[PDB]
Amino acid sequence: EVWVVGMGIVMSLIVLAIVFGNVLVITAICKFERLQTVTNYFITSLAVADLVMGLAVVPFGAAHILTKTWTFGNFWCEFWTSIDVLCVTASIWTLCVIAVDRYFAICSPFKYQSLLTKCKARVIILMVWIVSGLTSFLPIQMHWYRATHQEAINCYAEETCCDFFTNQAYAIASSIVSFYVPLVIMVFVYSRVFQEAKRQLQKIDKSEGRFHVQNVSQVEQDGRTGHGHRRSSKFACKEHKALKTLGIIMGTFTLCWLPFFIVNIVHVIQDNLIRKEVYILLNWIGYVNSGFNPLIYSRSPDFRCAFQELLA
């Protein structure tokens, strides 16, 4: 009915958001605007993972929903599904990696500079993609996931029918690796980081000079800012960075991802408890997570400038 147009428009906005956002954040190693920082590379990976989402996966999916059939063909259906899983795994995993990065901010007089990670951040990125690919493309192409079912066999063999069917064995490991583990790591990580923030502010509260000169007042200190940043600004950026990242990770996970990934287990454990509509909608919900990051995730001060300059 009305739904077709209504859905199409939304799909358009999402497809637009993911592409515009990811592309804006990164395209290729080349731009020189202070963004080069090593920590930034991880978000770059995030950006790339999300970019592919809006390019291949989400628009084909949208068209898929519009057509109510798969026009793409069998082999391409396989390709598309593979890219989908790869994108999701890469996204979630990357987010967890970032979480690890922030967690590593244990602080202390020495820890960051000495270790310099086990080796290189790049290896972490490659590992993420490699594990993501191994969990996706290899299993899919191999037909490891295919569960022998009459309907499954029929749809798979059929070139045009592109429907997602997976054996329980594939689903538990797939979901656990893709979503669950990173969820646990992030939960513990952000949790500890939160504790750290709390501690620092408390300690600061404990600290207090005797007999203040009188009082100080400030409202904006212009935008240019000057004179000094003091460590206050350090708390500024550390707490705000922690706050935005944590808010973004939890918000992405919950507004898009958790309901989907859990539902997977739900469908696997109990067979006729769920509708197919829920599966797709939830999956899209997860898709939106790719889109939000560039708007939110790239809050860093350098990022904002650099972004605005592009728009002007």
Q: Do the beta carbons of residue 91 and residue 252 sit within 8 Å?
A: no
One-character DSSP codes across 210-229: SS-SS----S---SS--S--
Q: Do the beta carbons of residue 115 and residue 70 sit within 8 Å?
A: no
Structural domain range at position 83: 2-311
Q: Which of 239, 303, 288 is nearest to 247 (CA)?
A: 239
Q: Which of 235, 185, 226 is nearest to 205 (CA)?
A: 235
Q: Which of 181, 185, 35 is nearest to 100 (CA)?
A: 185
- Please state, in angstroms and rounded to a whole number, the distance separating the CA atoms of residues 124 and 220: 40
- Please state, in angstroms and rounded to a whole number, the distance separating the CA atoms of residues 46 and 36: 15
- Count of CB atoms within 10 A of residue 285's CB? 16
Q: Which residues contact 120 (CB under 8 A, 6 or more apart)?
A: none
- Please state, in angstroms and rounded to a whole number, the distance separating the CA atoms of residues 206 and 25: 40
Q: In degrees, to the nearest 5, what angle opens at C-alpha 177 toward C-alphas 37 and 86? A: 65
Q: Which of 218, 253, 215, 250 is nearest to 236 (CA)?
A: 218
- Count of CB atoms within 10 A of residue 41's CB? 19
Q: Which of 147, 138, 129, 112 is nearest to 39 (CA)?
A: 112
Report which DSSP code applies to 119: S
Evaluate the CA torsion angle 82, 72, 63, 294 in order and state its sign: positive
- Please state, in angstroms and rounded to a whole number, the distance separating the CA atoms of residues 68 and 86: 24
How many domains in the chain?
1
Query: Two tokens at 267?
Result: 């469908």
**Which method was it determined by?**
NMR
CATH code at position 266: 1.20.1070.10
